[PDB]
Amino acid sequence: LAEHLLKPLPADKQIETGPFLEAVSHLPPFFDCLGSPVFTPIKADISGNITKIKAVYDTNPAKFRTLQNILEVEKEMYGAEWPKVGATLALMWLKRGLRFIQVFLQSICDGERDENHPNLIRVNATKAYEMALKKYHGWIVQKIFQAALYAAPYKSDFLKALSQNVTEEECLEKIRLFLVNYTATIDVIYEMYTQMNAELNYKV
């Protein structure tokens, strides 16, 4: 995780699109290592949105230099169909997948656990779902999440998968390092959606 740190935010809190997409493109591969085919469509969603954004960027890298540039250009370019269109829509869902990973990792690092089932990560995933995704899912998808929860690896196994021959404590310290700029970046993205009134709450 800490081999592909996100850059700190610059003083003007503008996120450059190219470096951002390069950075987060390192996350979907972690889903191949969780030991379940349940993760294949999850990986496709997150990668699919990165791809959607990268393809808008590639048409005009200068015009789409920053994530802010994307939202403002698309607002102008699309009129009434915006923000439910283009790279704006893909980023709206990408941020929520990114926020999920953030809350989950942070929960693990903060030592939140089920006292009764200490080596499970179900409480951490459940928190992350509630905070990042749940309100945008209808009852069917929520039910699928409840089923998929059972495919979670054991905590000890998860951390081992993210790690070199390194202790669990060492692994978590590196996860903490990653979370600094990751969290900061996602926060700026969420703030941007709020300022631009680009957030939608439709359920799927």
Interacting residue ranges for ligand OCT, rule: CB under 6 A? 21-22, 25, 28, 47, 50-51, 54
137 known member of a binding site: yes
Question: Could you tell me the end-to-end alpha-carbon distance of the chain, in angstroms, rounded to an integer?
Answer: 30
Closest distance of CB 19 from ligand OCT, Å? 9
Cβ atoms of 183 and 118 within 8 Å: the answer is: no
In whole angstroms, how close is the CB of 90 to ligand OCT at the nearest point? Answer: 11
- Residue count of the chain: 204
Say if residue 45 carries a ligand binding annotation.
yes
**124: number of Cβ within 10 Å:** 23
9: left (phi over 0), alpha (psi -120 to 50) or beta: beta
Does 78 belong to an annotated binding site? no
CA dihedral 109, 28, 132, 134 (to 10 degrees): -120
CB-side neighbour CA atoms (13 Å) of 52: 16
Contact 97, 46 (CB under 8 A): yes
- The answer to whether 46 is a known ligand-binding residue is yes
Q: Is 77 helix (H, G, I), strand (E, B) or coil?
A: helix
Least separation in angstroms between residue 123's CB and ligand OCT is 28
Whichever of 51 and 142 has its CB closer to ligand OCT, that residue is: 51
Least distance from ligand OCT to the Cβ atom of residue 193, Å: 20
Closest approach, Cβ 32 to ligand OCT, in A, equals 11
Which residue number places its CB atom closest to ligand OCT?
47
Residue ranges of the annotated binding site are: 45-52, 137, 202
